């Protein structure tokens, strides 16, 4: 399967509403996984299968969509929210993941 | 409280041998999924090899025939023989513990290995 | 499905006890009596509305017709004093009686 | 049947300042294998509730990092870090130990 | 068969208990077995029953949903877990065999071999 | 995940009614059920819950006997019987799912999700 993250260079000011959106080619609908990591860091998860808020993830990070479609949203940014953004394919054979955006507090 | 250790990476000549250490605190590698991740520079994520919970094996297209994942039930531990190894190998390798619908709870901070 | 006996019946010590349990189509069920001497767990006495089982004398005589079950003790003595429990078995259902207490003077 | 009584009946406090309800159970609640069956409900103003804390000190998916709960064997308390403006609304305990499941009266944390 | 009970004891409206009455012989793998509990002012009340197989279990109207009656035939002991323990629960129990194997013969029988009581009493 | 509870209305005394919980977005396969009541201003109160595939059917004494619940699990709906409504059980009516799906996650304890609920007035 190939995952197509959208767009891969990101820029927004403190406050901002952000989408960021990986496109599923095919249509799974439940198999997401956001991976935010800190410039030359340790990945975290964000929203595991998709909508649900992984503990301990602070309440401002919302992710939606099902199916062919999905999108992380972030409700007001803060200026350590640069990372760069990876999705996952989960329940799968190869793990494909997308190929990264880059959220700069700009 | 859970936390990997990695170790075993290095500079090595093209084709060499080589073997990585994932140490684990906490979850019990022998009955777990787990997986080995590659990062080469100026790239992002990718999938290497996954050893099930059972003791079944897992390796990618680009691994096949290269790699060997390996464990140890005395110390805890998850290795990967790491064997002819071309200019493409030369990356930062992470192990991640695989719960399926459930994402890469916990990772490992990182080894960079080095082709040269 | 409910079986009734008597609160308690008496009689004097040497005469003939009667002590009856009624039921809807009781006639047509078999039914079991049990002694339950105070202090005492309760033992069978009567069963299959005519048949009485090995260790107990004949005195005990139990009979079973239309609509009422009859347990009859000729002889009473001193330790017949006790309570006296109809059974009945319907739809595999255990439903015990009232249990008439009996007194013997 | 376990009746459980909360302390106090109404805690109105200022935003910003911290805020404990108490609420102790009549019998023992501990040990049903090894925890304490005591849960936290919020009822928002107008809205349904959902969990706050299970287990007595432990909470569920996505809950604020200002709540949490402590006491063991009757005394019980929820220990909010930091009262703000989305936190009115009436708390709620539950022994989650016999069949009878009974909640609290309701004990509202308001800005006054 | 000689049977004993045990269990027996103080809890709290709602709790748990397990009762149990064990027999000294073998034979017990032949009878079926019912739960008969004795009020502390009145006589006795039928609890539940169990076939000699295990496999044919029955309970009073006022009772299903809270026990649940369990033998061993290898292990010569039977059983009644006793959940809900309610107001008007507490008694004294008597297991009793019934002979017949099946639920369809237990009316050509009755109850003859009762073991001694055990005391179950549920109050705040 | 989303708890779509039906029916309720305005409805007889002593008369009856049927509700729904019409469950999806999870398993409800292996997960338990709740159902709680509130009557105006009164507090949230416990009526009933299921296991994972019925036959575990737990109530109050309020609700002995008067109240029966079911559910489908081929559909995924949540069931309740209602008879003989007294005054008493005028209330929103919330289902709710147990947090979990093993053992000693009491079919009767922690209550993860809830709905919306539905308002059943008994009156005339």
């Known amino acids: 399967i190939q995952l197509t993250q959208s767009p891969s260079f990101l820029s927004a000011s403190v406050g901002d509403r952000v989408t960021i959106t990986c496109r599923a080619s095919q249509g799974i609908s439940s198999d997401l996984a956001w991976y935010q990591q800190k410039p030359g860091k340790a990945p975290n998860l964000l929203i595991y299968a998709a909508s649900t808020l992984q503990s301990g993830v602070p309440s401002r990070f919302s992710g939606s969509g099902s199916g062919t479609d999905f999108t992380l949203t972030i409700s007001s940014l803060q200026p350590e929210d640069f990372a760069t953004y990876y999705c996952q394919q989960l329940n799968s054979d190869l793990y494909t993941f997308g190929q990264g955006t880059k959220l700069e507090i700009k | 409280e859970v936390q990997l250790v990695e170790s075993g990476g290095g500079l090595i000549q093209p084709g060499g041998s080589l073997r990585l250490s994932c140490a684990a605190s906490g979850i019990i590698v022998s009955s777990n999924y787990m997986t080995w991740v590659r990062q080469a520079p100026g790239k992002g994520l990718e999938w290497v090899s996954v050893i099930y919970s059972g003791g079944s094996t897992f390796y990618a297209d680009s691994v096949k025939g290269r790699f060997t994942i390996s464990r140890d039930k005395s110390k805890n531990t998850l290795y990967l023989q790491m064997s002819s190894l071309r200019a493409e190998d030369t990356a930062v390798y992470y192990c991640a513990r695989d719960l399926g619908p459930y994402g890469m709870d916990v990772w490992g901070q990182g080894t960079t290995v080095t082709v040269s | 499905y409910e079986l009734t006996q008597p609160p308690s019946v008496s009689v004097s010590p040497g005469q003939t006890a009667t002590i009856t349990c009624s039921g809807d189509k009781l006639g047509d069920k078999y039914a079991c009596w049990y002694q339950q001497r105070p202090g005492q767990s309760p033992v069978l006495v009567i069963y299959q509305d005519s048949k009485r089982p090995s260790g107990i004398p004949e005195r005990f005589s139990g009979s079973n017709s239309g609509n009422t079950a009859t347990l009859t003790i000729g002889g009473t003595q001193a330790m017949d004093e006790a309570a006296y429990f109809c059974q009945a078995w319907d739809s595999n259902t255990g439903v015990f009686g009232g249990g008439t207490k009996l007194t013997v003077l | 049947d376990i009746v459980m009584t909360q302390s106090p009946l109404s805690l109105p406090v200022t935003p910003g300042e911290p805020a404990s309800i108490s609420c102790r159970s009549s019998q023992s609640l501990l040990h049903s294998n090894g925890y304490l069956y005591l849960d936290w409900y919020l009822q928002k103003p107008g809205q349904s509730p959902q969990l706050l804390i299970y287990?007595?000190?432990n909470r569920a998916s996505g809950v604020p990092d200002r709540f949490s709960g402590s006491g063991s064997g009757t005394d019980f308390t929820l220990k909010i870090s930091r009262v703000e403006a989305e936190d009115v609304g009436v708390y709620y305990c539950?022994?989650?130990?016999?069949?009878?499941?009974?909640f609290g009266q309701g004990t509202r944390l308001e800005i006054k | 068969v000689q049977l004993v009970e045990s269990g027996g004891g103080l809890v709290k409206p709602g709790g748990s208990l397990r009762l149990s009455c064990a027999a000294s012989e073998f034979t017990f793998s032949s009878y079926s077995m019912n739960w008969v509990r004795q009020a502390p002012g009145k006589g006795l009340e039928w609890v539940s029953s169990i076939s000699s197989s295990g496999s044919q279990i029955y309970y009073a109207d006022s009772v299903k949903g809270r026990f649940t009656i369990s033998r061993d035939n290898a292990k010569k002991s039977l059983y009644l877990q006793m959940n809900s323990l309610r107001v008007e629960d507490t008694a004294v129990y008597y297991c009793a065999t019934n002979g017949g194997a099946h639920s369809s013969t237990w009316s050509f029988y009755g109850m003859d071999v009762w073991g001694q009581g055990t005391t179950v009493t549920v109050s705040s | 995940v989303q708890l779509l509870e039906s029916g309720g209305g305005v409805v007889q005394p002593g008369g009856s009614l049927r509700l729904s919980c019409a469950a999806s977005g999870f398993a409800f396969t292996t997960y338990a059920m709740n159902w709680v009541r509130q009557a105006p201003g009164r507090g949230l109160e416990w009526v009933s819950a299921?296991?994972?595939?019925?036959?575990?059917?737990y109530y109050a004494d309020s609700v002995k006997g008067r109240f029966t619940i079911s559910r489908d699990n081929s559909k995924n709906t949540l069931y309740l019987q209602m008879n003989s409504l007294r005054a008493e059980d005028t209330a929103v009516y919330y289902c709710a799912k147990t947090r979990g799906r093993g053992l000693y996650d009491y079919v009767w304890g922690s209550k993860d999700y809830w709905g919306q609920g539905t308002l059943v007035t008994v009156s005339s």
């Open positions: 299921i296991s994972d595939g019925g036959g575990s059917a």
């Open positions: 539950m022994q989650a130990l016999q069949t009878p499941g009974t």
């Open positions: 287990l007595g000190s």
